């Protein structure tokens, strides 16, 4: 979820993508319209 | 007790402006619990309701004549007046000014929605 | 708009008889109907309100009835001063209109 | 790097909604109750529950 | 080309900080901020449209924004962007802004209205450009060496990334109703309205002219405007009009990537 290799593909022109990040939806706040969520940050940026 | 008496000539030329001023006696239009109405009776026809006005200036009219009829208010003179532009030869009739109270009633029984006081009227002549 | 009609268009009866006039509306108006009496040269005067009760100060000989769409005006006994013109009027939904009326004459 | 896609929410008043499954990666759906959203001119829907 | 913007309209949305520490509904609102380039150039998305007047004619000096139930025009000279110290604006088109800015921890945008009123919105953010080479430096030198690098291109050509437009939902507005001594009145001003009251009779309809309701107080009715002729972006901050959306068209995202040296 948070290291090198969270997103994988076989070639830059391919359509098949594998993903293993965490995604959980949470309750909206009172009086507001929005879609909050929680997710692990990208692993490629961390490696750089 | 409130009584209604009018003023204004009942003789007008065609396509001109017909104006009827109904003055309040023993009362005032500053009251916020009453409407103010104008009604006509054509020869061979019953009473035709034209609409009503409110003391602040709120207005609503009959769909047929709304394109021409315009009501106003005169608090200092304690009067309410009607103005009907583009009069026709078919507009010769007898008019009456009347009043009615409005309030939040319940149980389907109330005095609301009925004309309680009436004027004397005029015989309008629309001719050249 | 609510369309109203009255029957009969004319009334001819002697002194002491019972006179009944019916008012029919094209739309439901529940308990919103009244009765107005018009003298010659004068404006109509309301005598019946709430479609059943009579106006205060009016003699008790006048009464009303009917419900839903058909309403009947009932006078217990005709009198010389009752020969006038009578109308009905509804008070449920705007715009508010009037009936065609009926003329009462001595038989 | 990756991107996340979020389409507009669906608000249904005086009723209950439901969702079906799909084959897209990392798909998720959920339903919440007891909402009373507002907009700039006043409340959205007439029902208060 | 600007032909793709002919049938669209601006919109309103929520903003977390209005300048005094409270929330508000604002005609300018922030979407996602992209920082993929290695030279430290930012790409911003807003809710107003730049370069187009109300009659779909091109003009570089004008922008249009959404007022209450109607669009209007304003001047470009008032547009500003800052993240602590002020930024420098390099290019604009439609919903998008390209800028360069110093390091900081906040980001704010603002503009000047048609009646001499200012607006602003603020979001948290973390900005720190990456380092190229084996030394850290603050400005461009006169004598040096060249290394590979990446940037954004000032081009308005068609690209392969697209966003969609849908039909707007109904818009409530309380001020339409007025109270006058025992009855409630409705004013229209030339639009379609949809009303529903829970009093006696359960009156409901779809009117285009003024009406009056008898013995039906306020605090029991609802109103909205329902006849629309333009399309709108499906922001995650506005509710859907129907269970299945009706797609009408799409527009493209400009300013693609390229290789350069620094």
Assign residue E105 the CATH number of its domain.
2.60.40.3200
Letter string b/e over residues B23-46, b meaning 16 or more CB atoms within 10 A of that residue's CB: bbeeeebeeeebbbbbbbbeeeeb
CB contact under 8 A, E210 and B54: no
Chains D and E touch (3+ CB pairs under 8 A): yes
CA–CA dist B64, B52 (Å, integer): 14
Residue of E nearest to C93 (CA): E214
Residues of E within 8 A of B60 (CB-CB) are 185, 210, 212
Which of B91, B87, B70, B65 is CA-nearest to residue B17? B87
Question: E36 to chain D, minimum CA–CA distance in Å?
Answer: 9
Name every chain A residue with its beta carbon within 8 A of the beta carbon of E150: none
B104 phi, psi to nearest 5 deg: -85, 95
Contact E14 A35 (CB under 8 A): no
Q: Which domain holds residue C60?
A: 4-106
- d(Cα E199, Cα E196) in Å, to the nearest integer? 9
Could you tell me which of E179, E206, E213 has the C-alpha nearest to residue E191? Answer: E206
Helices H / strands E in chain C, number of each: 0, 10
CB atoms within 10 A of CB E23: 12
Other chains touching B, judged by 3 or more CB pairs under 8 Å:
C, E
What is the DSSP track for E64-95?
EEEETTEEEEEEGGG-EEEESEE-EEEEEEEE
E234:D37 CB<8 A = no
* Number of domains comprising chain C: 1
The residues on D that touch E, with CB distances below 8 Å, are 1, 6-11, 37, 39-44, 46
Hey, what are E246's tokens? 């009706």
In Å, how far from its chain's centre is CA E43?
Answer: 15
* Alpha-carbon span C92 to C95, nearest angstrom: 9
Q: How far is D44 from chain E (nearest CA, A)?
A: 7
Expressed as residue numbers, the domain containing E120 is 13-169+251-262
Q: Which domains does chain B have, with CATH numbers?
A: 3-126 (2.60.40.10)
Interior CA angle at C82 toward C76 and C86, to 5°?
95
| Distance between E173 CA and the closest CA of chain C, angstroms | 24
> What are the CA-CA distances from residue E109 to residues C2, C35, D12, E43, E82 (Å)?
58, 69, 34, 13, 7
Task: Decide: D1 and A42 in contact? Cβ < 8 Å.
Answer: yes
Signed CA dihedral, E87, E88, E92, E98: sign only: negative
Task: Give residue for tokens 């948290």.
Answer: E124
The answer to whether chain D touches chain A by having 3 or more C-beta pairs less than 8 angstroms apart is: yes
**C67: domain CATH number?**
2.60.40.10
Alpha carbons C36 and C30: distance in angstroms, whole number: 18
- Residues of chain D neighbouring E236 (CB-CB closer than 8 A): 6-9
Question: CB-CB: which of D6, D25, D26 is closest to A35?
Answer: D6
The answer to whether the CB atoms of E239 and D41 lie below 8 A apart is no
Q: Are E36 and E51 contacting, i.e. CB atoms less than 8 angstroms apart?
A: no
Residues ≥6 apart with Cβ < 8 Å to E258: E150, E151, E152, E153
Contacts of A6 in chain D (CB under 8 A): 2
The Cβ-side half-sphere exposure at E120, using a 13 Å CA radius, reads 16
Q: Do C36 and B121 touch (CB under 8 A)?
A: no
Supply C47's token pair. 């005598």
Residue with token string 């009765």: C35
Which residues on chain A are in Cβ contact (under 8 Å) with E236? 34-35
Tell me how far apart the alpha carbons of residues B119 and B108 are, in angstroms, rounded to a whole number.
28
Question: Which chains have at least 3 CB atom pairs separated by less than 8 Å from chain D?
Answer: A, E
Could you tell me if E95 and E45 are in contact, meaning their C-beta atoms sit under 8 angstroms apart?
A: yes
Q: What is the SS3 assignment for A44?
A: helix
Contact at CB, D32 and A7, closer than 8 angstroms = no
Q: By the CB < 8 Å criterion, does E217 face chain B?
A: yes
**In which element (H, E) is residue E125 found?**
strand E118-127
Cβ atoms of E41 and E34 closer than 8 Å: no
CA pair distance B54, B51, nearest whole angstrom: 11
Q: Taking a C-beta distance cutoff of 8 angstroms, is the pair E177, E183 a contact?
A: no
- Contact list in E for residue C92 (CB cut-off 8 A) is 214
* Nearest chain D residue to A24, by CA: D28
Q: Are E152 and E41 in contact (CB under 8 A)?
A: yes
Q: E26: which 2 tokens?
A: 């604002």
Identify from E214, E215, E216 which residue to disrupt to test chain C contact, counting C C-beta atoms within 10 A and taking the largest count.
E214
Beta bridge partners of B52: B37, B60
A27 close to D (CB below 8 A): yes
Output phi, psi for E254, to 5 deg. Answer: -80, -170
In degrees and rounded to multiples of 5, residue E5 shows phi and psi of -100, 15
Structure tokens at E65: 């924004």
Q: Strand pairing partners for B118?
A: B98
Half-sphere exposure of E167 (CA within 13 A, CB side): 14
Q: How far is D22 from chain E (nearest CA, A)?
A: 15
Tokens representing B47 are 């009473």
Closest CA to E207 of E220, E226, E179, E228: E226
Q: What radius of gyration do chain E's Cα atoms show?
A: 24
Nearest-5° angle of CA B93, CA C19, CA B94? 5
- Calculate the dihedral angle through the C-alpha atoms of E197, E199, E202, E203, rounding to the nearest 10 degrees: -50
Q: Show residues of chain D in contact with A19, CB under 8 Å.
A: 2, 25-26
**Residues 1 through 48 of chain A touching chain E, CB cutoff 8 Å:** 32-35, 48
Query: Cβ contact (<8 Å) for D26 and A18?
Result: no
């Amino acid at each position: 979820p948070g290291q090198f290799g969270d997103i994988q593909s076989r070639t830059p022109e391919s359509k098949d993508v594998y993903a293993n990040t965490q995604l959980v939806l949470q309750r909206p706040a009172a009086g507001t319209v929005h879609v909050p969520y929680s997710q692990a940050p990208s692993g490629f940026k961390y490696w750089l | 007790q409130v009584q209604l008496q009018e003023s204004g000539p009942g003789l007008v030329k065609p396509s001109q402006t017909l104006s009827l001023t109904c003055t309040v006696s023993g009362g005032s239009i500053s009251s916020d619990d009453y409407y103010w109405t104008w009604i006509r009776l054509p020869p061979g026809k019953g009473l035709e309701w034209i609409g009503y006005i409110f003391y602040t200036g709120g207005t609503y009219y009959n769909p047929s004549l709304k394109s021409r009829v315009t009501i106003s208010l005169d608090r200092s003179k304690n009067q309410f007046s009607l103005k009907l532009s583009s009069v026709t030869a078919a507009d010769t009739a007898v008019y009456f000014c009347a009043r009615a109270p409005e309030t939040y009633c319940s149980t389907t029984n109330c005095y609301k929605g009925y004309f309680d006081s009436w004027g004397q009227g005029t015989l309008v002549t629309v001719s050249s | 708009d609510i369309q109203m009609t009255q029957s009969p268009s004319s009334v001819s009866a002697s002194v002491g008889d019972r006179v009944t006039i019916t008012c029919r509306a094209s739309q439901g108006i529940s308990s919103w109907l009244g009765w107005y009496q018009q003298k010659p040269g004068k404006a109509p005067k309301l005598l019946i309100y709430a479609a059943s009760s009579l106006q205060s100060g009016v003699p008790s000989r006048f009464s009303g009835s009917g419900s839903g769409t058909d309403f009947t005006l009932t006078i217990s006994s005709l009198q010389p001063e009752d020969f006038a013109t009578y109308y009905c009027q509804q008070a449920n939904s705007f715009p508010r209109t009037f009936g065609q009326g009926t003329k009462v004459e001595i038989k | 790097e990756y991107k996340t896609v979020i389409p507009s929410p669906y608000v249904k008043c005086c009723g209950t909604a439901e969702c079906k499954d799909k084959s897209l990666p990392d798909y998720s759906c959920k339903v919440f109750t007891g909402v009373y959203p507002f907009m700039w001119g006043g409340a959205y829907c007439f029902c208060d529950a | 080309n600007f032909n793709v913007y002919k049938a669209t309209r601006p919109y309103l949305a929520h903003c977390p900080d209005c300048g005094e520490g409270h929330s508000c509904h604002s005609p300018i609102a922030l979407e996602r901020i992209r920082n993929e380039a290695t030279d430290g150039t930012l790409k911003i998305q807003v809710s107003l449209q730049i370069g187009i007047k109300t009659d779909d004619s091109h003009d570089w000096t004008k922008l249009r924004y959404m007022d209450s139930h109607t669009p209007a025009d304003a001047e470009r000279a008032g547009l500003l962007v800052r993240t602590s110290a002020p930024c420098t604006i390099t290019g604009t088109m439609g919903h998008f802004i390209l800028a360069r800015c110093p390091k900081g921890e906040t980001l704010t945008v603002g503009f000047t209205d048609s009646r001499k009123i200012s607006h602003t919105c603020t979001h948290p953010f973390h900005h720190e450009p990456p380092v190229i080479g084996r030394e850290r430096f603050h400005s461009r030198p006169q004598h040096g060496k060249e290394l590979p690098c990446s940037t954004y291109v000032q081009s308005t050509a068609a690209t392969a990334e697209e966003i969609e437009v849908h039909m707007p939902p109904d818009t409530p507005d309380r001020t339409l109703m007025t109270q006058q001594s025992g009855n409630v009145k409705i004013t229209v001003n030339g639009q379609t309205v949809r009303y529903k009251c829970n009093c006696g009779g359960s009156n409901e309809g779809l009117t285009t002219t003024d009406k009056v309701i008898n013995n039906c107080k306020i605090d029991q009715c609802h109103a909205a405007v329902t006849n629309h002729k333009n399309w709108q972006y499906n922001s995650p901050l506005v509710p859907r009009n129907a269970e299945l959306g009706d797609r009408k068209g799409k527009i493209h995202i400009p300013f693609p990537l390229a290789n350069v040296t620094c």
